[PDB]
Design an enzyme around this catalytic site. Structure first.
Site, PDB file in Angstrom:
ATOM      1  N   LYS A  16      10.768  -4.684  66.682  1.00  0.00           N
ATOM      2  CA  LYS A  16       9.537  -5.467  66.538  1.00  0.00           C
ATOM      3  C   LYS A  16       9.418  -6.489  67.658  1.00  0.00           C
ATOM      4  CE  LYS A  16       9.517  -3.080  64.152  1.00  0.00           C
ATOM      5  NZ  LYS A  16       8.147  -2.472  64.144  1.00  0.00           N
TER       6      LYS A  16
ATOM      7  N   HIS B 164      10.768 -10.604  55.795  1.00  0.00           N
ATOM      8  CA  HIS B 164      10.361 -12.006  55.932  1.00  0.00           C
ATOM      9  C   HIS B 164      11.101 -13.064  55.131  1.00  0.00           C
ATOM     10  CE1 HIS B 164       7.412 -10.728  58.704  1.00  0.00           C
ATOM     11  NE2 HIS B 164       6.642 -10.124  57.814  1.00  0.00           N
TER      12      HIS B 164
ATOM     13  N   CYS C 260      11.815 -14.669  65.424  1.00  0.00           N
ATOM     14  CA  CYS C 260      12.592 -13.862  66.361  1.00  0.00           C
ATOM     15  C   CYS C 260      11.671 -13.093  67.311  1.00  0.00           C
ATOM     16  CB  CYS C 260      13.503 -12.898  65.597  1.00  0.00           C
ATOM     17  SG  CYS C 260      14.731 -13.714  64.540  1.00  0.00           S
TER      18      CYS C 260
ATOM     19  N   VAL D  17       3.092 -21.748  55.679  1.00  0.00           N
ATOM     20  CA  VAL D  17       3.037 -20.343  56.031  1.00  0.00           C
ATOM     21  C   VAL D  17       1.701 -19.768  55.594  1.00  0.00           C
ATOM     22  CG1 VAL D  17       5.503 -19.845  56.020  1.00  0.00           C
ATOM     23  CG2 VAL D  17       4.238 -19.974  53.857  1.00  0.00           C
TER      24      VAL D  17
ATOM     25  N   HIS E 190       2.567  -9.874  52.511  1.00  0.00           N
ATOM     26  CA  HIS E 190       2.217  -9.904  53.935  1.00  0.00           C
ATOM     27  C   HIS E 190       2.368 -11.298  54.537  1.00  0.00           C
ATOM     28  CE1 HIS E 190      -0.047  -9.235  57.695  1.00  0.00           C
ATOM     29  NE2 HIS E 190      -0.672 -10.363  57.400  1.00  0.00           N
TER      30      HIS E 190
ATOM     31  N   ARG F 142      20.862 -20.116  63.042  1.00  0.00           N
ATOM     32  CA  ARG F 142      19.596 -19.427  63.298  1.00  0.00           C
ATOM     33  C   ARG F 142      19.356 -19.361  64.807  1.00  0.00           C
ATOM     34  NH1 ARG F 142      16.680 -23.670  59.640  1.00  0.00           N
ATOM     35  NH2 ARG F 142      14.690 -22.827  60.437  1.00  0.00           N
ATOM     36  N   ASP F 143      20.325 -18.793  65.525  1.00  0.00           N
ATOM     37  CA  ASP F 143      20.280 -18.705  66.984  1.00  0.00           C
ATOM     38  C   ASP F 143      19.918 -17.292  67.429  1.00  0.00           C
ATOM     39  OD1 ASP F 143      22.783 -17.740  66.070  1.00  0.00           O
ATOM     40  OD2 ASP F 143      23.716 -18.102  68.027  1.00  0.00           O
TER      41      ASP F 143
END
Length: 118
Positions: free
Chosen positions: A37, A10, A78, A100, A111, A18-19
């Site tokens: 994932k 994370h 993603c 967040v 987490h 950031r593509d």
């Protein structure tokens, strides 16, 4: 360990582009490819603000046992495209900027609640 693992899935300090290709690359080198994932989000920026979310400065209680940051963070979600669970794992990227929701243990993030990025 649990903290150190939170960073692995994370945290990504100074990302470049950031593509889509960024997701497929980092998802691979963060070992989230086999089996891949469905969804996973990376927080960017300075590490210390993310830890701070477990202090009163940059965090609030959230729900039953979570915590949600005051400040916002650059973020890269993603998302798996293509259904199959094993590599090659295709991802679409979506950049954003918001607080967040995390869980804390011994003052350290362990987490990420993906539900807010679903």
């Amino acid at each position: 360990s649990r903290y150190t693992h939170f960073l692995t899935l994370h945290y990504d300090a100074k990302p470049q582009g950031r593509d889509d290709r960024y997701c497929e690359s980092i998802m691979r080198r963060r070992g989230l490819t086999s089996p891949c994932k469905d969804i996973n989000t990376f927080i960017h920026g300075n590490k210390r603000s993310i830890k701070a979310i477990c202090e009163n400065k940059n965090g609030n209680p959230h729900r039953e046992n979570l915590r949600i940051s005051k400040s916002s963070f650059q973020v890269t979600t993603c998302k798996l495209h293509g259904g199959s669970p094993w590599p090659p794992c295709q991802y679409r990227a979506t950049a954003g900027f918001r607080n967040v929701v995390v869980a804390c243990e011994n003052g350290l993030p362990v987490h990420l609640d993906q539900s807010i990025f679903r």
